[PDB]
């Protein structure tokens with residue numbers, strides 16, 4: 001795969017843009033300056049084979065980059081990236097990881113370290129499917145743990161309920177491995193939104209299948225629990241992309 | 252008003268971010284590098300009194316920053332910033348001025364010149380109500396003029412049909428003064444979308460008032476014309492943010 005060109009310049013550019021102009025009244029500023037964050041990020045992966053990375057590789061970078069998150073606004077998602085982000089609305093309705101400083105800086109970028117100077121490759125990177133799971137998930141897995149650990153109040157979880165091959169909730173997903181296990185006692189409730197795509201067969205419903213397993217697990221951790229299927233605001237958002245779908249008929 | 256801090260750092264950061272990572276599959280890159288674009292932008296207003304500007308001040312910047320735009324996808328808007336951008340969906344369905352390089356770079360920034368060194372005022376900018384009209388609209392007026400000139404095929408125009416103090420179409424708005432006048436023979440149709448805010452009194456309707464004047468202007472330039480009010484895709488977006496509104500009742 002082809003890595004992102006001029007990684008350091010893109011990183012520093014997004015970091016200064018974020019500092020001075022993004023989420024100004026939504027998320028707090030980070031104390032470390034952009035060059036200090038870059039040194040920490042770069043130390044985490046440079047001069048290492050990518051298959052040797054693990055969940056602790058980026059721990060110091062995330063400690064430096066972590067922002068306190070607003071009460072009741074954190075959202076988690078699985079299988080519905082586009083819809084969850086449209087609904088979150090750039091921090092106005094809900095906060096996603098991609099709105100936080102580290103999530104915004106690295107979103108969609110591709111990078112890799114190497115053992116030989118200068119310690120990273122800006123022209124070619126080995127496919128990562130070849131690497132062990134803890135390395136493949138080193139960065140975004142640590143990103144999720146740190147983000148989830150900072151949540152307070154009610155948290156929201158948006159899932160896909162029309163995928164016959166991928167259950168709504170799975171223990172091996174990022175939500176299962178990194179987010180749910182890191183929710184602290186400052187969290188009070190997990191609110192689930194099950195998305196049923198327009199014109200597709202309905203597969204998962206609240207109170208049954210993997211969603212019933214999720215409910216049990218959440219209660220076992222003493223969090224309150226609730227679940228809704230295509231709530232109106234979410235349905236309207238789906239209808240805007242397919243206004244003639246039968247589920248979108250107006251009076 | 253308060254000037255944006257670290258203006259040059261923010262300008263250059265956004266420029267590099269855009270160049271390497273933004274709108275890669277919808278808009279072409281420009282050929283100038285970020286430092287050359289900064290030089291052009293800066294000389295337009297630097298070392299001059301804060302009100303000494305006209306439509307030609309940023310001429311070199313806009314020439315260097317202009318991109319060829321996708322046929323049938325250009326959208327213009329008046330009085331409905333949030334609704335138009337949410338509907339265009341960051342270049343998905345339509346492109347807006349704020350998705351192009353110069354628009355992305357300066358969106359929401361505040362800046363002004365002064366004669367004394369460093370040539371720009373880092374502490375305060377005029378109420379721009381204190382500056383004559385050709386100065387006040389120097390930057391965004393030239394941005395809109397250059398943008399309109401590059402549009403091709405069908406163009407779309409979203410306006411507010413519920414503002415009793417301001418008509419849907421005004422000859423002195425940026426669309427009326429800088430955009431409509433710069434549409435070329437390569438435009439073939441102007442498609443108007445009239446926004447009727449939820450729960451508010453309808454002020455303008457297709458086929459009447461300022462919209463009838465607009466139709467007369469469009470036809471004189473030999474372009475086809477059509478106008479619709481709250482088309483389904485837009486209504487659903489309005490309803491998503493206000494699901495209990497009466498216009499959103501389901502069958």
Ligand SMILES: OCc1cccnc1
Nearest residue numbers: 098106107108109140
């Ligand atoms: O590449 C961007 C990205 C990957 C995974 C999770 N969130 C953002």
Ligand SMILES: OCc1cccnc1
Nearest residue numbers: 349357358359360391
């Ligand atoms: O400040 C950003 C801006 C002003 C006017 C029009 N479009 C964008």
